[PDB]
Design a protein around this nucleic acid. Structure first.
Ligand SMILES: Cc1cn([C@H]2C=C[C@@H](COP(=O)(O)OP(=O)(O)OP(=O)(O)O)O2)c(=O)[nH]c1=O
Ligand SMILES: *P(=O)(O)OC[C@@H]1C=C[C@H](n2cc(C)c(=O)[nH]c2=O)O1
Ligand SMILES: [Mg+2]
Ligand SMILES: [Mg+2]
Ligand SMILES: [Mg+2]
Lengths: 555, 394
DNA sequence: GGACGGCGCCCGAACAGGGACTG
DNA sequence: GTCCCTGTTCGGGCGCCG
């Protein structure tokens, strides 16, 4: 039937009108499906026959449902959706099984023809006009009186209406938990099974009073419950399996599918990696372009396939116990983690592999993985976990002392599982006695892009390298790189580039620049580097000489 | 009867998404909003209202009470459009008079822009949405629309205490006086009773630029000094590095010891003098934004500058926590932001826009865990150059 | 086949700032 | 100013849910 809830008022955007779009040819199977659906909806007042006063139309079709025995009527409301007012969506996220607590009794039930039970604003109804074509016999015209499928207002208006409808029941029953995901209700309680079932009947009669049927066909009463794509057993949850494509030629679309499925799997499978497969999509043309799997992507995909051949499950949240998050490092800026309470019983798992910034190191990436996990934990469990990290306390101490930014990690304990996260070199705080002093500089001509990089040294050595198709910033980095190549294990370098100083000072070990990577390799080789700054073009000695040298061809 | 209010011309309302809340904060918000709804102060709304403004809660120190806080920064930006003695009083107390605002209705057409959404743990339910019916705490329009009632309430207390300085900034009264702290608190309780109807600003000091003292100077020491003085000359044109720089001719080792000439010594002593004088020609502009920059000096030390034009600092200071056996950079930065904002409010009546030296994500993950004010300043995230940290270091 | 809303991931386009440079 | 380099947001594919 139709809910007697008040309708949600909706308008079009200012100065716009309803859709006028011709119905396209449907196949006869879908014409019969739609005809049967529509004669029944019309008998029920969910749709109304319209006449010629209704100038509007928008195309209709139908598809199979999850239950392949049933059809679903859909409308291509893209034009009306364009012309409809904005909404604030109320679905803020996706509930996750690792956030469920142990309940004595559990029921999962579904609303029958949920949208078609919620009334639509009368003033808006005329814009929902559609046409059923005949197997010629004339074709019938209709409009909606309930929420249509394909309209952009329907999901939020339904989620809000469901919430209003559940409010009196939730108030009368504060201690029955109802996870409400669009129209699917997970219901848990600390009652014995008989009293739980009685409460479920009260909930069903409450919904029926408000127009929502709960067909027994979708009333799950026994574990494992099918919920949100998972199987909920009494003490563990599993994910319904992930079939990766097993193709030989791979298109961009094939790789998007693979990466999406791996990401989905990483919530419970430890160690999933998508770095190579994802970078394999850089600068692609279109979904149909054929990418060749690089050998790195080959290996990564193989590791993931082996990972996915394994049996795995989650457990439920016990709020009387701490949440523990343990992070592990793999290369190329990739991390995995497990969140658990008891030692070998994951609540869930995850991966973090986002590349932030042209240049970075492993301590930064660990800090941002910790941040990602913290906010995910707050969403799922409403509290922050205690961390177990592969980084020595002294490494972190050194970094937080040296690093000029505010940075912090919550309560954490060191975990001795390699690869340990470390800083790979450390700049000196003071100039080095006995180490040669290089004054470096670079100039570049903005018109010709020709440049020079070089050094003079206090021990009388000078070198200038010419560069093509370069920039001032690149010549400053090149001068530093050159001083590094031509110096001993200990070296003082004076630059005038606060660009280069700002990069090297933050101690990167990864970069997207080949030149900065070469510099990092040199820095790791050295025993001691001291890198000072002076202001350019102020005549400070040493700097003056090298500036004169590298300016010759360029300025 | 309400006061019709409008957005600035050509501006739509706020559409800011709600960020994740801890269980504690959600439970406190749900209780507070239940009571507010049952008193008519707010109403449940639906998704057909396209507006949203984030909401959280803060539990004040040693207090069992939570306080709801709406982040009205966006809506305050879009909403249509000072006692010099306050910064001088011996002591200043800050009273939270925001509750008063719930006595005044809000213009019906404006209510839709005050929409906010309570989340749920693990997305058990869709968000639950409300709008205001009364003057909201945290909204620019509340102290404005209420100012006449506030002045009528305060008139007699002010007449009976002409030496007291009372200042309103949106949810707070700042009450300043020159009393022994016991008599001061007695008068503050007189006011808190009257309203049934601790700072010490004269101790805030300025943190000057300072130059090293040495009996031996290397090429490195002098290079560092010359760069710092070159930077400082943009604030003080009197600074000169001619002779100090003269000592650096040639291509020398960084650790070579350079003896300071007479000329260079006099240049250094003169620069030490010039860094004492106040920055000339710096006049507060009410129509402009206050910019606050913060630098982490390390070891619990933080420096800051408040300006409106580059190098025209209105104030420079430091916030210096202690040793830090278990130190929290984000906590200390949040505390520094609140202290600096408090000073700005007292001195100029504005809050500053903060250039925060932190990664956006670190800050947004943790700052509400250390917040204690009823206002929130605007801010932005910067990757500071370590050079300016060295320039202001003490 | 194909319509909708949510969240996630990844990437590139279109911005926004700030530092160095030219004669 | 221009050029360069870096960061952020947002839209478009795909994954998952209903
Ligand atoms: C799966 C799905 C769903 N929906 C909308 C419509 C109804 C609600 C609930 O989905 P549903 O339970 O499968 O369909 P429903 O109309 O309730 O009919 P039943 O088969 O459950 O009786 O979400 C949609 O618009 N597109 C979709 O693909
Ligand atoms: P919506 O009503 O689409 O929710 C999905 C619904 C709940 C369970 C049910 N279901 C049944 C079966 C037999 C299955 O294999 N998967 C599945 O999701 O569909
Ligand atoms: Mg259903
Ligand atoms: Mg359903
Ligand atoms: Mg240079």
């Amino acid at each position: 039937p139709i809910s007697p809830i008040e309708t949600v008022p909706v308008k079009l955007k200012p100065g716009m009108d309803g859709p006028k779009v011709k119905q396209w040819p449907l196949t006869e199977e879908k014409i019969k499906a739609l005809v049967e659906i529509c004669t029944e909806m019309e008998k029920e007042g969910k749709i109304s026959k319209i006449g010629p006063e209704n100038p509007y139309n928008t195309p209709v079709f139908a598809i199979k449902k999850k239950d392949s025995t049933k059809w679903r009527k859909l409308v291509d409301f893209r034009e009306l959706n364009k012309r409809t007012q904005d909404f604030w969506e109320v679905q803020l996220g996706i509930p996750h099984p690792a956030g469920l607590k142990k309940k004595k009794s559990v029921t999962v039930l579904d609303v029958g023809d949920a949208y078609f039970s919620v009334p639509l604003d009368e003033d808006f109804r005329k814009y929902t006009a559609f046409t059923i074509p005949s197997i010629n016999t004339p074709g019938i015209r209709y409009q909606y009186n309930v929420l249509p499928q394909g309209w952009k207002g329907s999901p939020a208006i339904f989620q809000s209406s469901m919430t209003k409808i559940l409010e009196p029941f939730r108030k009368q029953n504060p201690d029955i938990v109802i996870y409400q995901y669009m129209d699917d209700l997970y219901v848990g309680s600390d009652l014995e099974i008989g009293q739980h079932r009685t409460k479920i009947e009260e909930l069903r009669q409450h919904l029926l009073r408000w127009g929502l049927t709960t067909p027994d066909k979708k009333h799950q009463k026994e574990p494992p419950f099918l919920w949100m794509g998972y199987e909920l057993h009494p003490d563990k949850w599993t994910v319904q399996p992930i079939v990766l494509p097993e193709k030989d030629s791979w298109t961009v679309n094939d790789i998007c599918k693979l990466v999406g499925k791996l990401n989905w799997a990483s919530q419970i499978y430890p160690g999933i990696k998508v770095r190579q497969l994802s970078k394999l999509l850089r600068g692609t043309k279109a979904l149909t372009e054929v990418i060749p799997l690089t050998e790195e992507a080959e290996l990564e995909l193989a590791e993931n396939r082996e990972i996915l051949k394994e049996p795995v499950h989650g457990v439920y949240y016990d709020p009387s116990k701490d949440l523990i998050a343990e992070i592990q490092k793999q290369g190329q800026g990739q991390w995995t983690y497990q969140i658990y309470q008891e030692p070998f019983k994951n609540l869930k798992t995850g991966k973090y592999a986002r590349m932030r910034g042209a240049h970075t190191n492993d301590v930064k990436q660990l800090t941002e993985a910790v941040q990602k996990i913290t906010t995910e934990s707050i969403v799922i469990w409403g509290k922050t976990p205690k961390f177990k990290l592969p980084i020595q306390k002294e490494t972190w101490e050194t970094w937080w002392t040296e690093y000029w930014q505010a940075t912090w990690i919550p309560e954490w304990e060191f975990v001795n599982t390699p690869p340990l996260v470390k800083l790979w070199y450390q700049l000196e705080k003071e100039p080095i006695v006995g180490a040669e002093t290089f004054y470096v500089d670079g100039a570049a001509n903005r018109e010709t892009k020709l440049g020079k990089a070089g050094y003079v040294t206090n021990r009388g050595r000078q070198k200038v390298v010419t560069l093509t198709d370069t920039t001032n910033q690149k010549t400053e980095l090149q001068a530093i790189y050159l001083a590094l190549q031509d110096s001993g294990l200990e070296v003082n370098i004076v630059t005038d580039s606060q660009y280069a100083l700002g990069i090297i000072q933050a101690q990167p070990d990864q970069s997207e620049s080949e030149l900065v990577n070469q510099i990092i390799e040199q820095l790791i080789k050295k025993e001691k580097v001291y890198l000072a700054w002076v202001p350019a073009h102020k005549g400070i000695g040493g700097n003056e000489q090298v500036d004169k040298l590298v300016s010759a061809g360029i300025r | 009867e309400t006061v019709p209010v409008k957005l600035k011309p050509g501006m739509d309302g706020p559409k800011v998404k709600q960020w994740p809340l801890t269980e504690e904060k959600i439970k406190a918000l749900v209780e507070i909003c239940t009571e507010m709804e049952k008193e008519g102060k707010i109403s449940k709304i639906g998704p057909e209202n396209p507006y949203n403004t984030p909401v959280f809660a803060i539990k004040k120190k040693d207090s069992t009470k939570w306080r709801k806080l709406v982040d009205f920064r966006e809506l305050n930006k879009r909403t249509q459009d000072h006692p010099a003695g306050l910064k001088k009083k011996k002591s200043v107390t800050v009273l939270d008079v925001g509750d008063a605002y719930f006595s005044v209705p809000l213009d019906e057409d404006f209510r839709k822009y005050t929409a906010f959404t309570i989340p749920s743990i693990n997305n058990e339910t869709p968000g639950i949405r409300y709008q205001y019916n009364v003057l909201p705490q945290g909204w620019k329009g509340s102290p404005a629309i209420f100012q006449s009632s506030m002045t009528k309430i305060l008139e007699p207390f002010r007449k009976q205490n002409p030496d007291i300085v009372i200042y309103q900034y949106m949810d707070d009264l700042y009450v300043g006086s020159d009393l022994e702290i016991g008599q001061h608190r007695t008068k503050i309780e007189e006011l808190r009773q009257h309203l049934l109807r601790e700072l010490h600003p004269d101790k805030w000091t300025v943190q000057p630029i300072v130059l090293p003292e040495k009996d031996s100077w290397t090429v490195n020491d002098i290079q560092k000094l010359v760069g710092k003085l070159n930077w400082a000359s943009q604030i003080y044109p009197g600074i000169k590095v001619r002779q100090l720089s003269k000592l650096l001719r040639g291509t020398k080792a960084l650790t070579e010891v350079i003896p300071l000439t007479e000329e260079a010594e006099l240049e250094l002593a003169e620069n030490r003098e010039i860094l004492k004088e106040p920055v000339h020609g710096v006049y507060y502009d009410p129509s402009k934004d206050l910019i606050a920059e913060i630098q982490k000096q390390g070891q619990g030390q933080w420096t800051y500058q408040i300006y409106q034009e580059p190098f025209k600092n209105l104030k420079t200071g430091k916030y210096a926590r202690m040793r830090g056996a278990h130190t929290n950079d984000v906590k200390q930065l949040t505390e520094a932001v609140q202290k600096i904002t408090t000073e700005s409010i007292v001195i100029w009546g504005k809050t500053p826009k903060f250039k925060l030296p932190i990664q956006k994500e670190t800050w947004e993950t943790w700052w509400t865990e250390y917040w204690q004010a009823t206002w929130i300043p605007e801010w932005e995230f910067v990757n500071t150059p370590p050079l300016v940290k060295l320039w202001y270091q003490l």
